Symmetry: D2
Subunit: 381 residues, 4 copies
């Protein structure tokens, strides 16, 4: 009959109106300052552009071994040129109190050194996966963090991704029933002309082939989806001997794991076949399919039963949670500010590395390897 009060009270003249409804995550502050270490592929395509969507984090400094590249990137991102560092003068960030944390986006073998160096500079450390190339180095990093009284977070972006968290939630709410089979597959074609992949062919830098680089998503994913750790592992690997890419590292590897609950998993990683990021969890009541499972964008999950497929993915007009990149960045910031623990700490990063080494041993010996070593996931999956 008549218009509502709020509609009728709007002026036809230019006037100030209130704060609008948020249908997306809005910015708060830029109180946490980061120093980005290693201006490569992941850093420039994903990390550096992910800072804009953060609610509490900011890019404070850059550490790079390419001066011209660093000067360009600093200009692109509004960083002070006086805040550009190199690998030799790296330790001088300890004098800057505006740098709260350090994000190491270097190649695998150089992770430990710079983490440790950052801990000695009194900084918090966000380190990329995989943690280190050895179990001892993972331990060294943890010890150094403890000694410095700083936080160590591993860059497991899937622990902050909405679709992956949705999947975990429904599994935890018993929608699939009793879990018995998990299947993962993660692959992408290795290109040696790409500079980011050049160190990945080198065993001394990478620390392993496809399992270390992308098989780890299927490995870490299996653990968080099941909410448990494997007690036994078995594996096989093969790479074509005439392929020049696989001289030092593995192309394809298949691993099987047994969990205390009775659950089994079979997974694989590949450097020679196209884009695959597919996870499947089988329960007695339903089956969950994640394809794409661990993408940067467009992840989709589906719960299937006979005659039904219930799918979820991000909405078309709203953004109910923030993206995995911005959320990961803000997570360390929030844990530091609020004095809470980190969801992806160094012990979690150490566990994957230890399991990878066990998988590599099982593939090498051809025997099963016991991995029942009592790792307990702090704060849940």
């Amino acid at each position: 009959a008549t218009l509502p009060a709020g509609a009728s009270q709007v002026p036809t003249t230019p006037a100030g109106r209130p704060m609008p409804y948020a249908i997306r995550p809005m910015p708060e502050d830029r109180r946490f300052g980061y120093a980005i270490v290693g201006l490569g592929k992941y850093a420039l395509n994903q990390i550096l552009p992910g800072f804009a969507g953060c609610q509490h984090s900011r890019i404070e400094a850059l550490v790079s071994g390419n001066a011209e590249k660093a000067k360009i990137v600093a200009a692109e991102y509004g960083v002070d040129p006086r805040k550009i560092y190199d690998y030799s003068n790296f330790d001088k960030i300890a004098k800057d109190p505006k740098i709260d944390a350090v994000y190491i986006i270097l190649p695998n073998s150089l992770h430990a050194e710079f983490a440790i160096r950052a801990f000695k500079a009194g900084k918090h450390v966000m380190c990329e996966k995989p943690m280190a190339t050895s179990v001892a180095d993972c331990q060294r990093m943890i010890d150094a963090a403890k000694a410095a009284n700083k936080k160590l977070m591993i860059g497991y972006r899937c622990h902050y991704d909405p679709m992956n968290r949705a999947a975990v939630k429904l599994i935890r709410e018993n929608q699939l029933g009793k879990l018995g089979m998990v299947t993962t597959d993660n692959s992408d074609v290795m290109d040696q002309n790409d500079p980011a992949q050049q160190w990945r062919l080198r065993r001394e830098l990478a620390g392993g082939g496809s399992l270390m680089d992308i098989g780890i998503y299927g490995l870490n994913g299996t653990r968080y989806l099941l909410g448990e750790e494997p007690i036994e592992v078995r594996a096989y690997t093969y790479s074509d001997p005439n392929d020049e890419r696989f001289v030092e590292v593995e192309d394809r590897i298949i691993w099987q794991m047994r969990f205390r609950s009775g659950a089994l998993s079979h997974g694989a990683s590949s450097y020679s076949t196209t884009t695959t990021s597919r996870f499947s969890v089988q329960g007695d009541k339903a089956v969950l399919l994640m394809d794409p499972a661990t993408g940067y964008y467009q992840n989709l999950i589906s719960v299937q039963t006979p005659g039904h497929a219930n799918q979820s993915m991000m909405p078309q007009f709203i953004m109910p949670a923030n993206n995995q990149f911005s959320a990961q960045l803000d997570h360390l910031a929030e844990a530091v500010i609020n004095n809470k623990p980190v969801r992806s700490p160094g012990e979690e990063g150490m566990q994957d590395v230890r399991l990878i080494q066990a998988i590599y041993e099982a593939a090498r010996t051809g025997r099963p390897v016991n991995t029942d070593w009592g790792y307990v996931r702090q704060g849940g999956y």
Copy 2:
């Protein structure tokens, strides 16, 4: 047999490496400065966060009627507090030479005044859809732009969206065959408690109901998908008389159009039913389905023939084109810098408004309205 040269030449020591491969759009500059006018729902959720992904644009100033809100937003976005303006002091932006363009994100009826005022201040104008609430006002805005020797762009985000451009491309490449039927549906539930919707219930501010607000996507979309203009239009509208939201404006309206080619279209808009953004184009060789068609995120297109459904949407790891928000922003910047014309100019915005008025007349009279007035789309669809 042996490793490739580039893999073997990588040092095991920390070293500078080259510029990495881009798999996403990287920043270039921030050479084009914008003044954002109207700090509301669209501005705060979509526009302001879309600036980060631009390659040439930057937020230079803010114009708002809410000072406290403006001070908060400026702080969030790094804007100088000295660059915050209000509606009375709006014309003083002419003194600032760092402000290149003005983006008007005000309610429909206030679009013309501020556009004209910005043209008198020597600025380029990006104006939101729908252009104005009258055809004469659209004309006034165009005249003012011409007189100022400035560019006028209407905020049709779908003209810069990758999935929508993909759809146009395949239609143009004859994948559906000879086109004969188009079906569009755009709807969302109108909430009067939301402040952004309060002016939308008012005829004096909005200039029409659902067709003006969301039916325009289906209308503009039909034209770009077909690549032609309608010569005849017919319509019907209904709103429940006891619903307090539809006292001044229309809830539901259905319109049918005829094109010179022989093609027909049937479409509708609704303020009382949930999220629908679905377009369908029927040809004699294939049928194209766009659902979601005009979302902010997650658009998906599908080409169907018997036994087949070929789908496209954005990739999971790469971002081959930029998003619709950032691209729209950068478009005006690029046209100004490179001296090229704008893809969504004022004449295009004027055409939709003229067609909407014709549709409203046809619904009011119950007779068909001839719309064969010789509009030619400059630069294509």
Copy 3:
């Protein structure tokens, strides 16, 4: 620990075992005998092969005007050659008591005559859609059925299709909320070289173009999905004047309807664009998409809300309901045997024909046509 009793009691020697679990509809009898009238496209591809899946029906006789064709078909289907009739000797089926019903699969204009003739022969009549080409003929058929004390069923296969019934169920269970918008589209390319389509180009035989043939699915579907009848109708039609197929009948037609509940619908039919069978129902809580909506096989339904798409279609190993063809056939049989009414009676067939005529009038005059004539759907939708 030990095996269960039933597993342990199975002999290792060849032995008779029980009746197995049905995961599909099993045969019961062949107690209802049908005479198939008109050995054409629908009859030979869909109807005649659909008898095998019936639980109570059988093909008893064939009536055809092509003797050679009839002799071949009878041999294919195991029908007695003595039970083959022609159009002149049609009435002699009254002497056969093994023929319970007659299924008329003739062209539209010949429906009434043969229905009436079958009623005079004391048979039940299953007649194909559309019922007749006139409202009076529909009435004549109904009167004749009443007088004979026989059942009249119209061949609306979608009233016996599992996916279509599933859709109705969820709408009725309030899963979409309050309904406001329905969109239907039914099309297929008309080929004049096909003999089944040759009578469809003739107005005297077909009784109308695309609306009569395939637009009726969208019309009947709208009514059953909404669970109500339209009180007002509006329409437009166009066919290209140089196209030789559309000299007597319509190619494309778009119709809009208003329901007493407030709901609106917009739909269309086409003879010149490819395979489209798409229905969409918009509510305030959710949106239902049926694509394919009225196929012979592979129908799929989807309930969408932001971030979700819940789909249903037939299961991969089980068949919980019978197919639409067999179920339709068995329906008339079951109503006769159990003395219950038919779900798709002649009054329902008469209603569609009356609405089609109203739609044709509205398209011809260009004015809205009131269709509030008090039709009540007996036994529900």
Copy 4:
């Protein structure tokens, strides 16, 4: 302008018309007579109803150990009661010349005996998967067939399924590129109250657990998709020791295979988790997903690349190929009549059984088993 000749020549009077266009497979004859052996779950739900869609086959006789059940089924299917046999009088089918072949749908361990007995009765044999429970028995069956000069076909329904054949075709046309990874998963929850599953828990009757029953789809499928045989196999199995269903047979088993081409595969079968029939083939150009892969109905295939998913499944109005059941039945008939070889012969059935035994050995020993024994697939995959 004017109507076409064929449309204009149609009479308005009842007249005979030609043979219509087939959009589905029509019947030809019933020249091949089958004797169905074992009236159980598969026979009654899939096989017996699949005869109706055959173009050359017919059910001639029934062999069963349950007389009451056999009498009911014969009546349902129109079989002469004089043609009902039991296991003792089985050999008396040699006197009937109307019985051309025998279809053995008995439990696994009883397959060889009845096949051999049918070969001595001068009949062709269609035998169900898995061929036998031993390699020697498979060999005995082959020898017996050779000696009788009769054909032996194994019931691999997926070799006659349209979606599975479509998948093979595109792989063969190089749409995925160079193949490197195959992943299969086949599972369904084992119910001991179902009589069909009671012999499946018994090792003496079944010959193995899940791999023998459903893992074989993933095993046979991998071979036909790759178009090659494995030279090496590795496996692991686990069943919960307190579960009463898995006392004699395996619940879950995971197997990995290596092919001469370099390709790898990882697959699994399960008796304790719900309906899964998912195959994935990874190439360097694209990835193929089959889900459902080996269903009775509704199989769907999808070719994925970044930003694209091209799907295929059966059409909504046409049926371009016959179903897997009817086609399998007609295949043996056609090979006999036309003197061509069978696509799924005994050597193919023997190969799967030999590979299964090798997989069981590898799981038992925990060592890899060489399977490079020179099997050549006759007539292709």
